[PDB]
Design an enzyme around this catalytic site. Structure first.
Site, PDB file in Angstrom:
ATOM      1  N   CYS A 171      -1.746   0.621  -3.891  1.00 36.97           N
ATOM      2  CA  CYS A 171      -3.075   1.235  -3.734  1.00 36.97           C
ATOM      3  C   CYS A 171      -3.062   2.701  -4.209  1.00 36.97           C
ATOM      4  O   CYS A 171      -2.315   3.510  -3.681  1.00 36.97           O
ATOM      5  CB  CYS A 171      -3.523   1.170  -2.250  1.00 36.97           C
ATOM      6  SG  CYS A 171      -5.128   1.954  -1.966  1.00 36.97           S
ATOM      7  N   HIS A 219      -3.218  -8.746  -5.117  1.00 38.83           N
ATOM      8  CA  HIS A 219      -3.743  -9.865  -5.857  1.00 38.83           C
ATOM      9  C   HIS A 219      -3.540  -9.659  -7.372  1.00 38.83           C
ATOM     10  O   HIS A 219      -3.165  -8.542  -7.874  1.00 38.83           O
ATOM     11  CB  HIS A 219      -5.231 -10.033  -5.537  1.00 38.83           C
ATOM     12  CG  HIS A 219      -6.022  -8.806  -5.830  1.00 38.83           C
ATOM     13  ND1 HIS A 219      -6.404  -8.459  -7.110  1.00 38.83           N
ATOM     14  CD2 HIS A 219      -6.441  -7.807  -5.022  1.00 38.83           C
ATOM     15  CE1 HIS A 219      -7.066  -7.315  -7.066  1.00 38.83           C
ATOM     16  NE2 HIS A 219      -7.098  -6.896  -5.809  1.00 38.83           N
ATOM     17  N   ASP A 220      -3.810 -10.774  -8.065  1.00 39.54           N
ATOM     18  CA  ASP A 220      -3.693 -10.864  -9.517  1.00 39.54           C
ATOM     19  C   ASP A 220      -4.849 -10.120 -10.181  1.00 39.54           C
ATOM     20  O   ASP A 220      -5.822  -9.722  -9.520  1.00 39.54           O
ATOM     21  CB  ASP A 220      -3.644 -12.357  -9.946  1.00 39.54           C
ATOM     22  CG  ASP A 220      -2.380 -13.059  -9.457  1.00 39.54           C
ATOM     23  OD1 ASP A 220      -1.380 -12.362  -9.188  1.00 39.54           O
ATOM     24  OD2 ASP A 220      -2.392 -14.313  -9.351  1.00 39.54           O
ATOM     25  N   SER A 276      -5.252  -7.100 -11.314  1.00 41.96           N
ATOM     26  CA  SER A 276      -5.512  -5.714 -10.882  1.00 41.96           C
ATOM     27  C   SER A 276      -5.964  -4.866 -12.103  1.00 41.96           C
ATOM     28  O   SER A 276      -5.712  -5.232 -13.281  1.00 41.96           O
ATOM     29  CB  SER A 276      -4.282  -5.112 -10.132  1.00 41.96           C
ATOM     30  OG  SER A 276      -3.852  -5.839  -8.958  1.00 41.96           O
ATOM     31  N   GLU A 285     -12.683  -3.521  -4.026  1.00 45.15           N
ATOM     32  CA  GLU A 285     -12.034  -2.403  -4.731  1.00 45.15           C
ATOM     33  C   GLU A 285     -12.904  -1.837  -5.861  1.00 45.15           C
ATOM     34  O   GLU A 285     -12.931  -0.617  -6.078  1.00 45.15           O
ATOM     35  CB  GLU A 285     -10.641  -2.820  -5.188  1.00 45.15           C
ATOM     36  CG  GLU A 285      -9.697  -2.969  -3.981  1.00 45.15           C
ATOM     37  CD  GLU A 285      -8.598  -3.996  -4.142  1.00 45.15           C
ATOM     38  OE1 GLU A 285      -8.457  -4.613  -5.220  1.00 45.15           O
ATOM     39  OE2 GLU A 285      -7.845  -4.160  -3.157  1.00 45.15           O
TER      40      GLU A 285
HETATM   41  C1  HEM Z   1      -6.200   1.058   5.087  1.00 47.04           C
HETATM   42  C2  HEM Z   1      -6.934   1.087   3.971  1.00 47.04           C
HETATM   43  C3  HEM Z   1      -6.490   0.439   2.646  1.00 47.04           C
HETATM   44  C4  HEM Z   1      -5.527  -0.479   2.429  1.00 47.04           C
HETATM   45  C5  HEM Z   1      -4.545  -1.121   3.428  1.00 47.04           C
HETATM   46  C6  HEM Z   1      -5.507  -0.781   1.018  1.00 47.04           C
HETATM   47  C7  HEM Z   1      -4.654  -1.683   0.407  1.00 47.04           C
HETATM   48  C8  HEM Z   1      -4.667  -2.021  -0.938  1.00 47.04           C
HETATM   49  C9  HEM Z   1      -3.845  -3.028  -1.609  1.00 47.04           C
HETATM   50  C10 HEM Z   1      -2.790  -3.933  -0.921  1.00 47.04           C
HETATM   51  C11 HEM Z   1      -4.186  -3.028  -2.918  1.00 47.04           C
HETATM   52  C12 HEM Z   1      -3.615  -3.896  -4.079  1.00 47.04           C
HETATM   53  C13 HEM Z   1      -4.635  -4.923  -4.624  1.00 47.04           C
HETATM   54  C14 HEM Z   1      -4.279  -5.276  -6.068  1.00 47.04           C
HETATM   55  O1  HEM Z   1      -4.840  -4.489  -6.883  1.00 47.04           O
HETATM   56  O2  HEM Z   1      -3.479  -6.231  -6.428  1.00 47.04           O
HETATM   57  C15 HEM Z   1      -5.221  -2.018  -3.101  1.00 47.04           C
HETATM   58  C16 HEM Z   1      -5.827  -1.726  -4.309  1.00 47.04           C
HETATM   59  C17 HEM Z   1      -6.815  -0.805  -4.523  1.00 47.04           C
HETATM   60  N1  HEM Z   1      -7.295   0.122  -3.608  1.00 47.04           N
HETATM   61 FE1  HEM Z   1      -6.687   0.253  -1.622  1.00 47.04          FE
HETATM   62  N2  HEM Z   1      -6.505  -0.041   0.408  1.00 47.04           N
HETATM   63  C18 HEM Z   1      -7.140   0.720   1.370  1.00 47.04           C
HETATM   64  C19 HEM Z   1      -8.180   1.600   1.160  1.00 47.04           C
HETATM   65  C20 HEM Z   1      -8.718   1.994  -0.047  1.00 47.04           C
HETATM   66  C21 HEM Z   1      -9.825   2.920  -0.231  1.00 47.04           C
HETATM   67  C22 HEM Z   1     -10.597   3.598   0.914  1.00 47.04           C
HETATM   68  C23 HEM Z   1     -10.023   3.071  -1.550  1.00 47.04           C
HETATM   69  C24 HEM Z   1     -11.087   3.950  -2.262  1.00 47.04           C
HETATM   70  C25 HEM Z   1     -12.185   4.381  -1.655  1.00 47.04           C
HETATM   71  C26 HEM Z   1      -9.057   2.212  -2.227  1.00 47.04           C
HETATM   72  C27 HEM Z   1      -8.949   1.978  -3.585  1.00 47.04           C
HETATM   73  C28 HEM Z   1      -8.282   0.921  -4.162  1.00 47.04           C
HETATM   74  C29 HEM Z   1      -8.495   0.482  -5.523  1.00 47.04           C
HETATM   75  C30 HEM Z   1      -9.542   1.063  -6.485  1.00 47.04           C
HETATM   76  C31 HEM Z   1      -7.544  -0.660  -5.758  1.00 47.04           C
HETATM   77  C32 HEM Z   1      -7.388  -1.483  -7.052  1.00 47.04           C
HETATM   78  C33 HEM Z   1      -6.213  -0.945  -7.884  1.00 47.04           C
HETATM   79  C34 HEM Z   1      -6.054  -1.758  -9.154  1.00 47.04           C
HETATM   80  O3  HEM Z   1      -6.747  -2.798  -9.253  1.00 47.04           O
HETATM   81  O4  HEM Z   1      -5.242  -1.376 -10.048  1.00 47.04           O
HETATM   82  N3  HEM Z   1      -8.270   1.584  -1.299  1.00 47.04           N
HETATM   83  N4  HEM Z   1      -5.493  -1.416  -1.881  1.00 47.04           N
HETATM   84 MN   LIG Z   2      -2.354  -6.729  -8.002  1.00 43.53          MN
END
Ligand code: HEM
Ligand SMILES: [Mn+2]
Ligand SMILES: *[C@@H]1O[C@H](CO)[C@@H](O[C@@H]2O[C@H](CO)[C@@H](O)[C@H](O)[C@H]2NC(C)=O)[C@H](O)[C@H]1NC(C)=O
Ligand SMILES: *[C@@H]1O[C@H](CO)[C@@H](O[C@@H]2O[C@H](CO)[C@@H](O)[C@H](O)[C@H]2NC(C)=O)[C@H](O)[C@H]1NC(C)=O
Ligand SMILES: *[C@H]1O[C@H](CO)[C@@H](O)[C@H](O)[C@@H]1O[C@H]1O[C@H](CO)[C@@H](O)[C@H](O)[C@@H]1O
Ligand SMILES: *[C@@H]1O[C@H](CO)[C@@H](O)[C@H](O)[C@H]1NC(C)=O
Ligand SMILES: *[C@H]1O[C@H](CO)[C@@H](O)[C@H](O)[C@@H]1O
Ligand SMILES: *[C@H]1O[C@H](CO)[C@@H](O)[C@H](O)[C@@H]1O
Ligand SMILES: *[C@H]1O[C@H](CO)[C@@H](O)[C@H](O)[C@@H]1O
Ligand SMILES: *[C@H]1O[C@H](CO)[C@@H](O)[C@H](O)[C@@H]1O
Ligand SMILES: *[C@H]1O[C@H](CO)[C@@H](O)[C@H](O)[C@@H]1O
Ligand SMILES: *[C@H]1O[C@H](CO)[C@@H](O)[C@H](O)[C@@H]1O
Ligand SMILES: *[C@H]1O[C@H](CO)[C@@H](O)[C@H](O)[C@@H]1O
Ligand SMILES: *[C@H]1O[C@H](CO)[C@@H](O)[C@H](O)[C@@H]1O
Ligand SMILES: *[C@H]1O[C@H](CO)[C@@H](O)[C@H](O)[C@@H]1O
Ligand SMILES: *[C@H]1O[C@H](CO)[C@@H](O)[C@H](O)[C@@H]1O
Ligand SMILES: *[C@H]1O[C@H](CO)[C@@H](O)[C@H](O)[C@@H]1O
Ligand SMILES: *[C@H]1O[C@H](CO)[C@@H](O)[C@H](O)[C@@H]1O
Length: 299
Positions: free
Chosen positions: A30, A106-107, A109, A184
């Site tokens: 993340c 997940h896949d 990304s 996301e």
């Molecule tokens: C406790 C809160 C959070 C947890 C546990 C968490 C967890 C994760 C995880 C496991 C992924 C990987 C998914 C993947 O892309 O395969 C992810 C991706 C992502 N997260 Fe977080 N997230 C949290 C909060 C946030 C917040 C608040 C934001 C922005 C406001 C954010 C932005 C993103 C984005 C944009 C991705 C996609 C990255 C990509 O696709 O390359 N996340 N998150």
């Molecule tokens: Mn991924």
């Protein structure tokens, strides 16, 4: 940034500097959690993290309200128990376990490779956790030559990523995850849509430079005029954006999309794993940090 720099003022009046992660520090898949840990708003070592620490960090330093991360918190702890084999209570063991594949991670990304992307054999796996500049470029290419993008553009981005992953992943691995990805998508609009434009809440436009800064650097684009959204973003904005992305009309359809790719997505719900299911091995790579250039404490 350094507390005395005033870089976050008046949106964030108690900043801490960027510090690159060391080889032993735990980082997430993340970009948000990684930026928070890089600043010590959650532990710099990425270990032993409570729900409230996360809630406060997001609210006070990113302008993201508690409602936004309620399901994400639930899912983080579900994955913690799944990966470790026991209840993690209110201390998330580390950030790295969140890269457990076909779970929360997940896949397709936007900026990470898939767990079995391009592998020669079926038992093999790669780094699906650290920021991958090439993958991110495949997302950015969709909006090449532009400074901002809208919901329709984001829908094209996620479609290109689904197409690429479905073609490049080891046969049988690729598993579409519209509900998580498009939460996301909503998160991207929530954090780096251009709040300086007059109709941001109705038709938010992502500033591409802000997005690139946040993802590449895993720190906050203050130097480009970003600040935490004020008032803090709430869950309604996020799921509304998620829905709007998936509702947007597709002007270019990539080949090799999984069935049902185009169209609305299911509401995200809590994850659950069978007590018998053994987790996939986590990628063990050292945490990524930006090197072209390396960042200083105020970057
Ligand atoms: C406790 C809160 C959070 C947890 C546990 C968490 C967890 C994760 C995880 C496991 C992924 C990987 C998914 C993947 O892309 O395969 C992810 C991706 C992502 N997260 Fe977080 N997230 C949290 C909060 C946030 C917040 C608040 C934001 C922005 C406001 C954010 C932005 C993103 C984005 C944009 C991705 C996609 C990255 C990509 O696709 O390359 N996340 N998150
Ligand atoms: Mn991924
Ligand atoms: C990652 O952060 C660095 C450091 O802030 C960015 O490079 C600087 O960008 C600022 C504007 O944001 C410029 O004023 C400086 O001249 C740049 N400094 C250096 C050392 O090059 C870098 O552009 C960021 N990366 C991305 C992709 O946004
Ligand atoms: C984050 O925590 C996870 C879960 O405890 C660690 O992954 C396990 O590490 C032990 C070695 O200490 C192995 O025996 C297990 O095989 C690992 N589990 C899985 C599913 O891969 C992980 O090493 C920790 N990462 C960091 C950087 O702290
Ligand atoms: C993670 O570490 C495992 C055991 O140390 C290796 O079997 C994995 O291949 C993976 O190694 C990768 O990341 C580490 C960083 O901890 C490097 O030391 C390796 O060179 C490799 O890139
Ligand atoms: C930062 O401090 C200024 C001056 O006291 C204040 O007006 C502003 O509300 C503060 N911001 C936050 C987020 O508390
Ligand atoms: C984002 O949120 C919307 C509304 O809940 C879903 O339809 C979509 O699949 C994604 O989870
Ligand atoms: C996004 O979607 C959720 C349901 O998934 C709503 O609760 C919210 O108001 C927004 O429309
Ligand atoms: C839900 O909210 C989003 C973000 O404010 C809007 O863009 C959308 O039109 C719907 O009202
Ligand atoms: C979810 O919400 C978005 C934004 O309101 C709609 O465009 C979509 O049709 C779905 O109802
Ligand atoms: C939705 O609308 C777009 C134009 O905005 C078309 O290109 C597409 O075929 C779909 O009907
Ligand atoms: C239709 O417009 C989309 C953006 O929504 C592009 O990705 C595509 O190339 C086509 O021109
Ligand atoms: C139209 O545009 C999309 C997004 O850029 C591509 O994925 C597709 O292959 C076609 O070129
Ligand atoms: C590309 O093609 C699909 C159908 O295969 C459409 O749904 C889309 O709007 C675009 O024209
Ligand atoms: C792969 O498929 C897409 C639509 O499914 C086409 O637009 C493209 O020309 C290629 O045949
Ligand atoms: C391809 O297959 C899936 C079944 O999982 C459907 O959801 C879709 O409508 C298409 O038939
Ligand atoms: C969530 O749902 C799964 C279904 O596989 C159960 O195994 C789990 O115990 C929890 O109820
Ligand atoms: C990252 O480290 C390099 C060392 O060359 C510096 O140039 C930069 O200021 C940052 O601290």
């Amino acid at each position: 940034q350094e507390p005395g720099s005033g870089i976050g003022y008046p949106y964030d009046n108690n900043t801490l500097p960027y510090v690159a992660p060391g080889p032993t520090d735990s980082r997430a898949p993340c970009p948000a959690l990684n930026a928070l840990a890089n600043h010590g708003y959650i532990p710099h070592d990425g270990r032993a993290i409570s729900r409230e620490t996360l809630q406060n960090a997001f609210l006070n330093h990113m302008g993201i309200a508690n409602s936004v991360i309620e399901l994400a918190l639930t899912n983080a702890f579900v994955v913690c128990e799944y990966v470790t084999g026991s209840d993690c209570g209110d201390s998330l063991v580390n950030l790295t376990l969140l890269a457990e594949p076909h779970a929360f991670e997940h896949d397709h990304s936007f900026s990470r490779k898939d767990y079995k992307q391009g592998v020669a054999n079926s038992n093999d796996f790669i780094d699906n956790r650290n920021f991958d500049a090439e993958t991110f470029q495949t997302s950015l290419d969709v909006v090449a030559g532009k400074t901002h993008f809208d919901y329709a553009d984001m829908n094209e981005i996620r479609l290109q990523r689904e197409s690429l992953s479905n073609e490049l992943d080891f046969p049988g691995w690729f598993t579409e995850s519209k509900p998580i990805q498009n939460v996301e998508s909503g998160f991207i609009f929530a954090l780096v849509s251009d709040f300086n434009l007059p109709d941001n809440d109705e038709n938010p436009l992502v500033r591409i430079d802000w997005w690139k800064y946040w993802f590449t650097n895993e720190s906050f684009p203050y130097h480009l005029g970003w600040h935490p959204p004020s008032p803090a973003r709430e869950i309604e904005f996020v799921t509304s954006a998620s829905s709007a992305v998936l509702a947007a009309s597709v002007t270019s359809t990539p080949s090799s999309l999984p069935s049902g790719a185009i169209g609305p997505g299911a509401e995200a719900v809590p994850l659950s794993f069978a007590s018998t299911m053994t987790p996939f091995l986590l990628a063990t790579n050292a945490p990524y940090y930006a090197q072209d250039p390396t960042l200083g404490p105020n970057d």
